[PDB]
Swiss-Prot record:
Morphologically, spectrin-like proteins appear to be related to spectrin, showing a flexible rod-like structure. They can bind actin but seem to differ in their calmodulin-binding activity. In nonerythroid tissues, spectrins, in association with some other proteins, may play an important role in membrane organization. Belongs to the spectrin family. It is found in: Cytoplasm, Cytoskeleton; Cytoplasm, Cell cortex. It comes from the Eukaryota. The lineage of its organism: Eukaryota, Metazoa, Chordata, Craniata, Vertebrata. Residues 1-57 form the SH3 domain. It comes from Gallus gallus (Chicken). This is Spectrin alpha chain, non-erythrocytic 1. Like erythrocyte spectrin, the spectrin-like proteins are capable of forming dimers which can further associate to tetramers. Interacts with ACP1. The chain holds residues 969 to 1025 of 2477 of the full protein.
Amino acid sequence: KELVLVLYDYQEKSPRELTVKKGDILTLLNSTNKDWWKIEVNGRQGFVPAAYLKKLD
């Protein structure tokens, strides 16, 4: 799976969003929307704004 780094803490604001912490490593599920990426971590799947994320590497 493609690894993604979380740059900054993100707090979920809607039911399909994931709360993530700076430094977390997530798996990328879908990046076809440039603004909101679907990611997976700890058996959960959801969305985080792409501005908080960087593909490794």
